[PDB]
Amino acid sequence: METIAKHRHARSSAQKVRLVADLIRGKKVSQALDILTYTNKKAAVLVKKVLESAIANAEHNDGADIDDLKVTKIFVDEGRTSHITVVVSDR
Amino acid sequence: MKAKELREKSVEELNTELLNLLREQFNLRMQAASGQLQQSHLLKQVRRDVARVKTLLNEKAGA
Amino acid sequence: AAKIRRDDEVIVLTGKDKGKRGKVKNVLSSGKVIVEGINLVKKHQKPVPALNQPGGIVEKEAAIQVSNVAIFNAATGKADRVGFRFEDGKKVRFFKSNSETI
RNA sequence: AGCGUACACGGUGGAUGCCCUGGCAGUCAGAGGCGAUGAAGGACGUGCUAAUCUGCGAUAAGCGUCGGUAAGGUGAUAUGAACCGUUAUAACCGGCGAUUUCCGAAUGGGGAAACCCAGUGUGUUUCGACACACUAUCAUUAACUGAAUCCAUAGGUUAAUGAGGCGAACCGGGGGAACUGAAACAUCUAAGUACCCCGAGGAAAAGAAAUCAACCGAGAUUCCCCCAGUAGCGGCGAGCGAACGGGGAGCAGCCCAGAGCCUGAAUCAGUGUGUGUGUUAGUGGAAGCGUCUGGAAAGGCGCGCGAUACAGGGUGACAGCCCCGUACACAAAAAUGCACAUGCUGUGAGCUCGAUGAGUAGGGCGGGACACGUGGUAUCCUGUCUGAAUAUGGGGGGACCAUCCUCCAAGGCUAAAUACUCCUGACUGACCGAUAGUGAACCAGUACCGUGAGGGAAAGGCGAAAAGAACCCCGGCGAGGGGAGUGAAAAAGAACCUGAAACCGUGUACGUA
């Protein structure tokens, strides 16, 4: 099972979002939400929206295993607009 | 329609066309401006009829 | 003279409707025809509470070219072509295969 | 750890590649112009409209009559509301007619382009207002009047012709640049080129010999070929560039010149009828079933049909047998160009004669200027006149008269082939593929620039079929994404023609202070 959440043509610089996301790679989703709650970076809001959308899509489609959900992949593509992409799965 | 009214004399045609223009055209435009008359077929019919009658009365008489 | 008009029995030659007969109700000016129960489509319409929304997916009919449908006659049971013949005071269409009159 | 090595995943893609509701260049025809009865082009309205192309003009996406067609249409963009009738008065196409706003040559006047202010006659009247026609322009023709001047003339009025400008080309003339070659350059080619005007034109001009020869000849004008890229010209350099002669399209020479004769004799333009051929809406016009893949067959296969029709186009990929069409056979209520036989007013047949174009040619006479200041030097008139013959005067030609012949004041006039397409109708392109092709394939002379004139771009390709991701969820009631569904296909998703690297991130395995 895999979950994908992406936002295209974000009104933010690609490098800023990349460096904000790099601070979150490898951290648990449950702890990632807490980390992003108090994060003051501008890209923090958009990455929080992306991850909440990802978990919502997983709940709509996936049956369970959200609690152990882990942030597997996170990246940003240059658009200067940016395209954020996040892949989350239990394994 | 195209030919039935042709044989009518000028006086009655003038009377009916002036009647239409003064009363029913005004009523129809007022109704349209008020938003009623959801069906516009009557508007087209009356406008075309008044156009026909006014176009006539010149070739029939005096020409 | 229009070879195809309202309420005409035809059979679709191609388009997943080979040999299935139908009755065209009208013909579009662009060369398309509308035959009920021949080509069903699943149109996804935008809901609107007013104007009697059909409700969700609409199982409607799509138009097909006249070329894909050939007129059918019960005289021989097979679709054929059509010609024009002069009657006493009018021109009328007639089938082929011994020239059945419509 | 951080790089390097490559692999996969993608995105920035944009090298390359296919097409077009588009251009460009040619071939054959009409037109080769319109209009005060108001040209084109603009301003403003006419749609159930928020807006547009086209149509139209307060009667306004339309009108009356006559034909073909007629069951879908009410033009579409681009859907929706609402309509009529469906075999003859829905509607569509065409022929002929009526309205046809304002400005605009723009015309009663004014005025600032879409603006304002009037008069006369005709009507009408609710005796307040409203509609119809006319009211710029100069001369000429005819008429009524007509001064200074008796008539006349000018002048006042009326009816008719002549132009109120635009538009691609050329005929002939007038003038009239720059640039370039000449190693730069005074002259010159340049170039009579850019440019403006004049008469009417679709063709025009010219169109019939004292025009050429050289002792013999073709004999109206124009275009083209050889002649010939030759002779010749040219600081004989660059470069320019013949003629004669012989052939293709064409090939009509008459007429007023005045008298008679016999004449309304063939011919010419105008003016009715009938026929044929086009325009002018259109009619008919052949042929496949099954099997298997294939998104869908027009694709592979079998057996059959017409072919005077296998030219072409559309139909989920390649169709003679699906359709539209082609060839072929037909058709016009009314208008309509072209040919004839054909009714009639006039010019108007043919023979004899000279007439042979008079103050005409030539001769001239002083000038200015013809670019020509006589330089190689010729042309206009004048200051003017003698002034021939009357095709009997000659006519110029290389042993004087050369032998020879001419052609000169008849013409006027005369059609043919011939330059070109602003625009229209039909056909073609081994011409191009959106920075090409037109500047403009897309609502392109469009955004925009520019007072105006004028200048002036970028932007094409979804899906055969929008049948356009119903629905649900998160999200901010947005944007965006995920499930589901349609769609063969969504590694076709409205940012939708195939789409490699360069460039940016993720994972994969190797070594890596």
Residue numbers in the entry:
A (entry chain S): 1 to 79, 99 to 110
B (entry chain Y): 1 to 63
C (entry chain U): 1 to 102
What does the paper behind this entry write?
The E. coli 50S large ribosomal subunit is composed of 33 proteins (L-proteins), one 23S and one 5S rRNA. The 23S rRNA consists of six architectural domains that, stabilized by the L-proteins, define the shape of the 50S subunit with its three protuberances. Here, we present a biochemical and cryo-EM based analysis of the earliest period of 50S assembly, utilizing an in vitro reconstitution system with purified rRNA and L-protein components. Taken together, early 50S assembly occurs in a domain-wise fashion, while late 50S assembly proceeds incrementally.
We provide high resolution structures of early pre-50S intermediates explaining their structural maturation via parallel assembly routes, starting with a particle consisting of density corresponding to the first ~500 nucleotides of the 23S rRNA and the proteins uL22, uL24, and uL29. The earliest state we identified contained strong density for ~500 bp of domain I and the L-proteins uL22, uL24, and uL29 (referred to as state d1). Hence, 50S assembly in vitro starts with the stable formation of the 5´end containing domain I, despite the presence of the entire 23S rRNA molecule. Interestingly, uL24, whose binding site is in the center of d1, is found among the first binders, which explains its role as an assembly initiator. Based on their intrinsic affinities, uL22, uL24, and uL29 interact with their RNA binding sites in domain I and nucleate 50S assembly. Assembly appears to nucleate at the 5´-end with the formation of domain I to yield state d1. However, this did not result in discovery of states that would support any nucleation point other than domain I. Thus, domain I indeed seems to appear first, while the remaining rRNA elements dock onto an already existing RNA surface. Domains I and VI exhibit full cryo-EM density within their domain boundaries as soon as they become detectable as parts of discrete states (d1, d126, and d136).
